[PDB]
Amino acid sequence: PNSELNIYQYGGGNSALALQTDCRNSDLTITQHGGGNGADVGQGSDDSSIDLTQRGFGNSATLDQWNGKNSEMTVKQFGGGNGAAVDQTASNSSVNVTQCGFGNNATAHQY
Amino acid sequence: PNSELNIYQYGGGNSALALQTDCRNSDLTITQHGGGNGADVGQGSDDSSIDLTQRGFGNSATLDQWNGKNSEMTVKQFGGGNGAAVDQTASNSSVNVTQCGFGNNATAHQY
Amino acid sequence: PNSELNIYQYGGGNSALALQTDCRNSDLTITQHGGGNGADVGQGSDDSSIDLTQRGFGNSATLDQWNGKNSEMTVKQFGGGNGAAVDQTASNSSVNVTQCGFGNNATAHQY
Amino acid sequence: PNSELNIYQYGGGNSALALQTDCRNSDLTITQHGGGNGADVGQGSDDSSIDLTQRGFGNSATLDQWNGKNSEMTVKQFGGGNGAAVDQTASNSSVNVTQCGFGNNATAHQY
Amino acid sequence: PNSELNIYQYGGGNSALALQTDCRNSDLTITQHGGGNGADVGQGSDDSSIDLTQRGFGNSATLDQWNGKNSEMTVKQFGGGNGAAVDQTASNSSVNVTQCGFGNNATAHQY
Amino acid sequence: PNSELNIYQYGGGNSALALQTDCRNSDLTITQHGGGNGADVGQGSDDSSIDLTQRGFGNSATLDQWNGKNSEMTVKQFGGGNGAAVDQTASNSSVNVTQCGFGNNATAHQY
Amino acid sequence: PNSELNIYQYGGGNSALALQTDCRNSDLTITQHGGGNGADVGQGSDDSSIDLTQRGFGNSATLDQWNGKNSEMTVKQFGGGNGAAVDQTASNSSVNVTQCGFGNNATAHQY
Amino acid sequence: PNSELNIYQYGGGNSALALQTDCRNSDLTITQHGGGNGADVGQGSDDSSIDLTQRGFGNSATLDQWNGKNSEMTVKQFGGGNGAAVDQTASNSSVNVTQCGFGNNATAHQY
């Protein structure tokens, strides 16, 4: 059971919360480029992947993948002030979020 | 159940909210080109597809895929300020909604 | 049941409402060219087809196909301000309404 | 395998790398307060904990916990430009690093 | 094997080098007060202790405790520029170094 | 074997060399008060003690306790520039040297 | 064998050389008061005593106990430049030498 | 064998030569008052005594007591430049020499 959590933070003013529990063979990566991006990621699913990359300024993300299996979730934010929340509990399922520009709001739920 | 939810944003000021639940072997894709388009997509149908594409400005869409099976959704806006709302519950059914121009309103239902 | 609802707008200020229920293996098609054309189409007929084409300005059509089977409705306005109201319940029947010019009014009923 | 990795950055310009694999039931905690602090932490040890606290600016610590069991590693850097390098492979073992001030360099290896 | 390594540095410009390997149930403590103090301490001895206290400036002590058991090594440097070099390999043995003043040099070997 | 070696230095510039090997259940104590005191003391005798007290400045003494048993070694140098050389090898023997004043030299041998 | 050597020197420039070997339960006391007194005392006699007291300046004494038993050896030199040479081998014997003044020479042999 | 040899010199320039060998239970006493007085005394006589008293300047005495038993030897020289030569070998014998004044010469033999 290899669980991997990576937090890559470049620039100034980025802040991160990352959480894995009961998630076997799961990968969760946080990469922040720029400034002021705040991150909160929860992973509790086996054989699942969470990939959160922030490039820009002022983006905020809340990401929860629970009780799933063989699930891939991706959130990529480019630009400024974009806010994302992703909840994924479906098994063998994928959620992909990519927001480019300013002030974009995205909410994704997969059960 | 291989379920994919895709949000691709190009431009500035677009907003999207996506819902996919109890949804086996189906795809939900939201693509916006331009600015200020607003979207709300709920998909709960097995072996189904929703394709919502916005190219232009100020278009508004609401899409609901519920309790169906083997159903297809393709909803397209070209231009400005087009507003569409579609409810589809029929199985083995498809609704293909397109607007070209400005200020067009379309309502579609399938049961 | 392969049932399709189609709405196409070209121009500006056109409005179309389409409702189709209990209508199996049937097509709903609306095409509006120009501006200010208004459409209200109800389809509840099995193995039936509705084709409404408005080309021009200010044309209005109210179309209802209920309880029929193997029925076809083709309503076409060319010009300005033409008004059509057609109600069809007969099975294995076809009504074809065509208006050319300005201010034409046509009512068709088939039972 | 409840394996948790937390990294907290408050301020701007901090850099931290955290790596957890082959590491069951283990916690890796990074807390960076200020700006420009550097951290590289690798964790591959069972039932182990890593705690890193950098408070100030420009501090450096390179931290490796591999192959160990029931092992705790603590480093607390207070001030500016402080350097500590700690490798841990010993089981049931602890290393405590406490740097206060500017330009401090102290290295510990535990096997 | 509850083995603890502690370093306490107060002031600026102090350097200490500590090594604890294969070293079960043992403690290594370094306490530097002032500035520019240097210490090199290696510990490879079971159930052993190393206590080093440097208070002042420019003090240097090079300490090695290897292959011993139940061994205690104490060095206390008070003042400036003091040097003590001690190697301890004997088991159930104790070394005491006490330097007060400036430029003191005392060397101890215990086998 | 409880073998404990003590060096106490008060002032600045005092120098002392102490060596304890194969010397079981023995105490090695050196006391230097003042400045510039030089001492070389080697102890390899079981159940033996060496007590060296230098109070003043520039005192020099060489003490060797080898191969003895139940032997006590005492040297007291008070004043300045006192020089004493003592070798003790006999068992159950005591050597006592007291120097008071300046420029004293004393040699004592016990076999 | 409780055998002790005592050397007491008060002032400056006094020199005393003492050897005790093979000599059980025996005493040697050297007391030098003043300056420039020279003493050479060798003892090899069981349960024997040597008492040398030099008070003044430039006094010289050479004292030898070898192979005797129950022997007592005394010289008291008061004044300046006194010279005493005593060799003792007999058992149960005592020689008392007392020099007061300047330039005294006294030699004692007892076999 | 309590055999005790005593020299008492007062003043400056007095010289004494004394030898006591094979001489058990006998006393050797030499007393010089003044200056430049010379003494040569050899004692090898059992249970015997030699009492030599020189008071003055430049007095000379040579005394030999050999092979005798229970023999007493008295020389009292008062004044200046007195010379006495006495050989005593007889047992149970007493020789008395008394010189007062200047330049006295006394020779005594007892066999």
From Swiss-Prot, chains A, B, C, D, E, F, G, H:
Keywords, sorted A to Z: Fimbrium, Signal
Induction summary: Under control of the CsgD transcription factor, part of the csgBAC/ymdA operon.
Single GO cellular component term: pilus
Domain of life of the source: Bacteria
Subcellular location: Fimbrium
GO MF annotation, one: identical protein binding
Stretches the record annotates as Disordered: 31-50
Biological-process GO terms, alphabetical: amyloid fibril formation; cell adhesion; regulation of amyloid fibril formation; single-species biofilm formation
Protein family per UniProt: Belongs to the CsgA/CsgB family.
Role summary: Curlin is the structural subunit of the curli fimbriae. Curli are coiled surface structures that assemble preferentially at growth temperatures below 37 degrees Celsius. Curli can bind to fibronectin.
Name of this chain's protein: Major curlin subunit
Organism: Escherichia coli (strain K12)
